[PDB]
């Protein structure tokens, strides 16, 4: 009864397949056509202990944007599917993680209501070939399909790779917390209104 | 083949029923337990030509918040249902409407991607018994379930009732435009990527 | 059943005759004794498709003010007469028009309630022999007798003739929109309160 | 030959009846459904010596706005009717009145041309249950149907009830002055252009 | 051996009864005469897993202040009673929780020394009928009788209901953490000075 | 009698072929050697309903500039050819379109007089391999050969791809409007001076 979400999503621009196990062992298996994003998805598996399987192709000759967005949308849907009615879970996650001089605080609530608060200030435009504007878009798209309340707050940082990587580490650990079983909940839905829904 | 969306939504806090006809004749039939919101929903019908049927009850002794939110969520879902695959529609709407000294520009895209840009500055806290913070929440919740890109821009205004009412008038007219048939489209999906989706 | 409004207005200072057809073909026939105003009224006909007949004489040796005002008052009354109960009309108009570097946004509502919002900053005092303060007065007087809510917003412009002319072009197109038949209205009055009135 | 104006005005939102005698003895008889407004209308009678009869009902569960506006519109029309051709009157009124620390200067001209200049800064949002934004709207609507040039200038004041009440006292006295017979006029129209008109 | 604290507290102004189980299952049973406060106390149970029983009556016709204060004082005493010598507990709690755009960080230490650090900026005066100044007073009074060091820090937020609710969610989770058994402590008092005391 | 403009333009630096149908069905067929520009030209077809055929080659090893410019010049000439004497057309177009957080207002007049007003602030230097300075140059060159008055105004936006794409969407819709038949014009030239000319 591991919670597994699977999504296939295709448009004229991109083709995406995602399989995520919330109760994983950190199996990392991401190939998006965007090497830096693959590296970040590896962090999600390694530090979140999610099993993360992603395959994507797309119109990277135009730019990485459509692929990045469509991967994020599909991951969000996969998370939503895996989570189901959200019975017995912690629901909330909260973690601050460094990478050297960078320090990122991530707080999230698996509420069913999409919201992104994001204040990263990434001081360079490209990390490798990866457009650093795409980080915000990745998280925005992911929250929109997952129905997640997500806050990402930059507390320190100078190196762009460090800032983004620390964000994924903190996110992975916050998401792990939120998705894990609350040992006291007794399988009840963790909401005073009796339901958690993306509608 | 009128496009009609119907939603019933209930929680421990509220009970909501919505029926909206996109191809209506402005039939107004809204009773939310929040008189000012009913007045605004009347504008949606009158100026958008939507048929709007809303019934809600809820925990207004705590405050109008949960009712307001839950009505908005249900309306957004009703719009999504009515819109279907979004074939043959204008998709985009754009209108600036006054009410006396107030002037509000609303621009929207039935994109499938939720976003609210909102800059109203409503100078009083209560219009009648209605908490003016709830206007932003109404639109935010509506975009989240409808999969709408929505921008609301205050160009002028001093009277709070005028500001909010002008917003609903402009929104109604922009939404009417966006939902109406594009006479040249020939029933094609109005997107270069071949699909419009909330996922 | 073309909607035609006719006004004769005389005082000790001026003598004015106006005939306007809302359902016209752009017949331009304006002679006010103020050549620049005649040029602007020509734009109203050409871009609004109104048939515009104006004759005025007055005390232009004192200045153009009284004539300009009295022409505007009479035009506003003519519009009010032509509009009648305002059944079946769009009611609202909204257009932004350029003339070269100038760009003017006009938004109006045939509400029955006079209001002018005006922010033009015309950088010279005379266009030909025409006092550029008289532009604001023209629109103010027109809204007062027509029962129009009118907003005029200068978005760009440097040449005074361009600024004023772009204003008349945008106004003409917004007014055309507002006066035209709403194809869905089914002849109903476009107001939730059941009536549109200058009282 | 007392100058009496009577108006009945009804919409889907409100029902209003007004009778005003310009040559009254201060008979106060106002019941609008808005107690604070009734108190202000009492000042109009007491200090203006108008006989003021007002009855209104309306949608106060939405808010007091529509009632307040519609009462003001009807009062303005009643004044216009009572004034007729404005022969033999002072036409202009000018008065500054205090209420304790508050001091309000009101200047008006029964010109036929609506204009409101208003600079009150009322430091609280509610006086009793009365929304203090509605004061400006009351005067704006009244000038629009009466064809009055009206300037209201706050010279001092801290208490909101005092500020608004002093405004009505000053207005009542300015309006009394303007409506009263000029003992030298000899029944002539007090305008160099030979007529005073709302058109 | 569930840790249960019970308090009955009465004055000439209020009557309060509280029963709290630190080792609860989130049983919510709060009726204070202040609906918004009841909603917040529901969050304490739902997210803290405390069993919370509160009954209060009082002089709400004067305002909600005395009731709010006296409920808070009684809850604090109930917590103190339930906690006893504080053997074997985590003692410290730390959590940041969102509600949509709002994000509140709560840190607390069950030290025996009362202190409130509070920086919320709640942008409206009333949530429903609840005076938003009373939030600070609730926490101040609670810390004073419980002997708690409590810091409440607003990281983001615009909607007053969201800000206050997120505060209670974060507080509930921090308090749950602090009151729970430390699995390594071996029942020792978690203080280098050998005792934790409100004196 | 579809309005079709065809241009072949060659220099030592570039070779360009353009065919545009103003009365198209959104046939997209653009290959410029600049993938991002191709994506933008696809928007022109999809949202403008133009049939757009572009082939270009050029000195992209130097940079994309000459190709971008020469494509724009050729498109402008193609539009001019297709438009002819501009009889019976709307002439003016005005639209504000979003893409998520980006919001761009485009206003244009097919006047015969070239002018570009442009205020985009695109926060990154490269979208994919496309130099973001080239957007302004594309529109400037296009207006110069088409004889178009064009204003592009950035109202909101953070993502460079979104800002540029929203610009093309708004432009396409404004241009569609301007080129479409005015149903009332009766085939007259929409100018008070009797002619529209690039000279
Ligand atoms: O839905 P939640 O479990 O976060 O909490 C219940 C209710 O408070 C919540 O729906 C709410 C949303 N906005 C204000 N409150
Ligand atoms: O999906 P749209 O039809 O708004 O346009 C296609 C594609 O450009 C779009 O998916 C996109 C999203 N972000 C950048 N582009
Ligand atoms: O009269 P309108 O049709 O613009 O809308 C009805 C009512 O809302 C309107 O009379 C009003 C005026 N001020 C606030 N509302
Ligand atoms: O109409 P009055 O009586 O205020 O004054 C005559 C004339 O000067 C007046 O109509 C005018 C209006 N604007 C400038 N002057
Ligand atoms: O009492 P605590 O366990 O927080 O720590 C012992 C001692 O350091 C503490 O009493 C103290 C108080 N002020 C400074 N130190
Ligand atoms: O040429 P148009 O149709 O925009 O309008 C006629 C005339 O006003 C115009 O040529 C002009 C140019 N500059 C000022 N006016
Ligand atoms: Mn995107
Ligand atoms: Mn790394
Ligand atoms: Mn909410
Ligand atoms: Mn209203
Ligand atoms: Mn004048
Ligand atoms: Mn000209
Ligand atoms: Mn009003
Ligand atoms: Mn008093
Ligand atoms: Mn106290
Ligand atoms: Mn709540
Ligand atoms: Mn160049
Ligand atoms: Mn794109």
Swiss-Prot record, chains A, B, C, D, E, F:
Activity regulation note: Weakly inhibited by inorganic phosphate (Pi). Competitive inhibition by 2-hydroxy-3-(1,2,4-triazol-1-yl) (e.g. C348), a potential herbicide.
Keyword Ribosomal protein: no
Catalytic activity annotation: D-erythro-1-(imidazol-4-yl)glycerol 3-phosphate = 3-(imidazol-4-yl)-2-oxopropyl phosphate + H2O
EC number: 4.2.1.19
Pathway the protein takes part in: Amino-acid biosynthesis; L-histidine biosynthesis; L-histidine from 5-phospho-alpha-D-ribose 1-diphosphate: step 6/9
Chief location category: plastid
UniProt: substrate binding residues: 13, 39-47, 65-69, 91, 113, 161-169, 191-193
The protein, known as: Imidazoleglycerol-phosphate dehydratase 2, chloroplastic
Species in which this protein is naturally found: Arabidopsis thaliana (Mouse-ear cress)
Designated gene of the protein: HISN5B
